Amino acid sequence: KWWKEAVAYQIYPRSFMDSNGDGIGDIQGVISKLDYLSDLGIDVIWICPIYQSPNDDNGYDISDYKDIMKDFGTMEDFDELLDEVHHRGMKLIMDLVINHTSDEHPWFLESRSAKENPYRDYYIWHEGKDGKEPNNWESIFSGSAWEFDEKTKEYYMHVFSKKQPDLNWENEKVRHELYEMVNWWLDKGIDGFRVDAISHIKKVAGFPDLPNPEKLDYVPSFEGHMNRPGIQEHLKELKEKTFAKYDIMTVGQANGVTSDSADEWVAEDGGNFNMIFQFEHMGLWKPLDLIELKTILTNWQNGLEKINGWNALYLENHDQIRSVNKFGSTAYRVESAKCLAALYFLMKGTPFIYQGQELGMTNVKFDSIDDYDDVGMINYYRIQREKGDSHDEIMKVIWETGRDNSRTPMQWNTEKNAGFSTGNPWMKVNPNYVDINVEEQKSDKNSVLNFYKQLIKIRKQHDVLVYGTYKLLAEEDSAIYAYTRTLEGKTAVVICNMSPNNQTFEFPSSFTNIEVLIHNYPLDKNETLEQCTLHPYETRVYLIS
Numbered sequence: 001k002w003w004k005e006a007v008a009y010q011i012y013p014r015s016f017m018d019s020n021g022d023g024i025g026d027i028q029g030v031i032s033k034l035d036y037l038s039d040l041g042i043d044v045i046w047i048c049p050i051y052q053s054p055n056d057d058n059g060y061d062i063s064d065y066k067d068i069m070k071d072f073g074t075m076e077d078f079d080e081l082l083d084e085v086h087h088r089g090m091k092l093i094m095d096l097v098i099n100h101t102s103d104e105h106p107w108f109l110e111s112r113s114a115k116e117n118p119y120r121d122y123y124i125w126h127e128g129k130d131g132k133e134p135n136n137w138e139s140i141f142s143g144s145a146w147e148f149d150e151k152t153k154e155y156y157m158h159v160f161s162k163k164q165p166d167l168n169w170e171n172e173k174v175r176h177e178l179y180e181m182v183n184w185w186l187d188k189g190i191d192g193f194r195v196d197a198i199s200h201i202k203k204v205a206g207f208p209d210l211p212n213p214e215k216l217d218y219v220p221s222f223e224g225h226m227n228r229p230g231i232q233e234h235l236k237e238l239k240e241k242t243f244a245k246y247d248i249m250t251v252g253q254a255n256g257v258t259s260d261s262a263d264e265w266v267a268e269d270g271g272n273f274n275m276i277f278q279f280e281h282m283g284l285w286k287p288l289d290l291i292e293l294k295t296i297l298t299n300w301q302n303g304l305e306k307i308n309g310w311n312a313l314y315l316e317n318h319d320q321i322r323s324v325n326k327f328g329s330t331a332y333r334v335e336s337a338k339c340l341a342a343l344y345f346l347m348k349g350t351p352f353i354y355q356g357q358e359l360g361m362t363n364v365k366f367d368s369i370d371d372y373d374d375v376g377m378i379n380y381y382r383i384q385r386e387k388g389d390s391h392d393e394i395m396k397v398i399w400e401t402g403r404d405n406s407r408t409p410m411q412w413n414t415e416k417n418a419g420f421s422t423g424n425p426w427m428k429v430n431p432n433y434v435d436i437n438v439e440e441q442k443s444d445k446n447s448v449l450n451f452y453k454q455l456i457k458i459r460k461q462h463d464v465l466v467y468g469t470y471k472l473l474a475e476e477d478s479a480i481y482a483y484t485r486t487l488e489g490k491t492a493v494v495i496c497n498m499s500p501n502n503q504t505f506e507f508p509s510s511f512t513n514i515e516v517l518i519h520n521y522p523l524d525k526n527e528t529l530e531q532c533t534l535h536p537y538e539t540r541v542y543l544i545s
């Protein structure tokens with residue numbers, strides 16, 4: 001329940017704050033900015049992986065689950081971070097990455113050392129077929145999902161990068177070691193987990209070839225490992241052996257789950273997580289099809305209400321482009337950032353703010369593939385360029401869809417590197433930091449940052465915005481996304497002009513009192529309540545008694 005009322009903030013530590021001048025964010029950097037997060041009103045901090053890692057996938061390739069990444073500091077630094085977070089009235093959830101390890105993890109170093117050894121079946125090994133890979137599956141990061149090991153003459157599976165071999169969840173030995181490791185972290189007093197790639201742990205037994213109608217070199221392989229039948233047996237055991245023993249919050253990153261199939265994931269009785277990140281609204285690749293977005297988010301609002309589930313509300317993370325670009329407008333950056341904020345944040349669920357979302361940070365356009373880092377897009381570039389795609393064609397995909405857009409340094413001020421670092425940042429700062437930065441937004445009462453501050457405040461002050469039932473209004477309006485939250489004798493009306501144009505809208509009205517809780521445009525003195533004349537990306541929230 002505390003997690004129902006929480007507002008969460010997601011830190012990408014490599015890009016949050018560099019405290020010692022090597023261009024890489026670190027834990028002491030996070031500590032130095034906890035005032036910022038406390039003042040914002042954040043309740044829960046989710047920090048991306050901070051464990052020992054070769055950083056082939058920036059922390060998601062872990063070589064020691066119980067040791068801190070050298071780039072980020074030491075276990076003392078972590079203990080200090082957790083102690084400071086907890087003394088400032090906040091909680092911290094860690095990133096739990098147990099679909100795969102680094103290929104430099106001691107388990108894998110042993111697993112690959114000999115065809116027979118005690119760790120061989122900790123991972124997924126198979127001999128080739130027809131002198132090629134065991135099957136035609138493609139890695140999510142492009143290329144084959146199998147990597148050949150010359151020494152033992154077999155392939156190992158990697159859904160993600162070649163340096164992220166998948167763990168074998170069919171091996172009871174593996175599961176036992178993972179549960180011990182999870183509880184070791186929970187025994188330290190962390191407040192839960194965001195659970196990485198968790199819908200990928202069940203592979204179709206025997207790893208059969210997938211249909212290949214377009215005769216590709218490798219076949220996108222989601223039907224072989226994403227949310228496959230049999231996964232719930234493993235997730236139920238994970239919950240029983242770890243999470244259920246502690247008063248924590250869990251949010252599973254669960255691609256491949258739909259609003260109709262969310263029951264076993266988040267239902268109040270028997271769900272294996274408190275909430276999940278679902279992906280149905282994040283793949284609508286021009287004028288946004290607003291009504292399609294209404295349909296998806298409404299499906300999840302209504303769907304989880306019926307099974308007493310809880311939604312995780314978000315538009316940004318370290319795997320997506322920036323939401324102004326994805327859902328708003330760079331022609332109305334500040335206005336659409338605030339409009340999007342009210343839109344997603346005030347639905348029923350637990351809202352997550354990704355670092356820089358509260359500033360209206362936007363996508364970046366670097367010309368050189370060497371300026372980027374994302375293993376997925378570097379791989380994509382190589383494979384597609386050999387296939388004849390031009391540099392411009394590939395950079396368009398990277399610019400418009402690549403997750404590096406969300407990994408540029410946090411923009412603190414207008415000093416060198418936006419104040420993120422005294423050194424040369426591991427990823428270049430967006431040049432628009434001269435216009436978009438924390439320092440400037442603190443002093444502007446109409447900044448995106450202070451709009452998020454107000455959103456957090458009104459959600460905390462009005463129970464209807466936490467527990468109120470959601471209802472979509474004006475479904476057929478292709479520009480206005482409007483909805484209500486209803487609880488006892490209070491109704492909140494959220495009105496978002498999700499368009500770059502002025503629009504008219506009849507107030508969807510039965511009240512003894514009306515109060516405007518938040519608005520991103522000055523109120524027009526002559527304007528009547530009944531006939532809204534909304535500016536581009538104007539949002540208003542009314543509270544009705």
Ligand SMILES: OC[C@H]1O[C@H](O[C@H]2[C@H](O)[C@@H](O)[C@@H](O[C@H]3[C@H](O)[C@@H](O)[C@@H](O[C@H]4[C@H](O)[C@@H](O)[C@@H](O)O[C@@H]4CO)O[C@@H]3CO)O[C@@H]2CO)[C@H](O)[C@@H](O)[C@@H]1O
Nearest residue numbers: 057060140160196197198253255279280282283284318319
């Ligand atoms: O630790 C390895 C990585 O794991 C985590 O991210 C993973 C997800 O768990 C995977 O499910 C997957 O998600 C991708 C997906 O591959 C890609 O197709 C795209 O998904 C679209 C989807 O196709 C579309 O139908 C709609 O639902 O929108 C989706 C989102 O746009 O994007 C997904 C998210 O990137 O791969 C990712 C890694 O890319 C972890 O968080 C990663 O940081 C980590 O590398």
Ligand SMILES: [Ca+2]
Nearest residue numbers: 018020024026
């Ligand atoms: Ca550093």
Ligand SMILES: [Ca+2]
Nearest residue numbers: 169170171230
């Ligand atoms: Ca089994």
Ligand SMILES: [Ca+2]
Nearest residue numbers: 524527533534
């Ligand atoms: Ca007006």
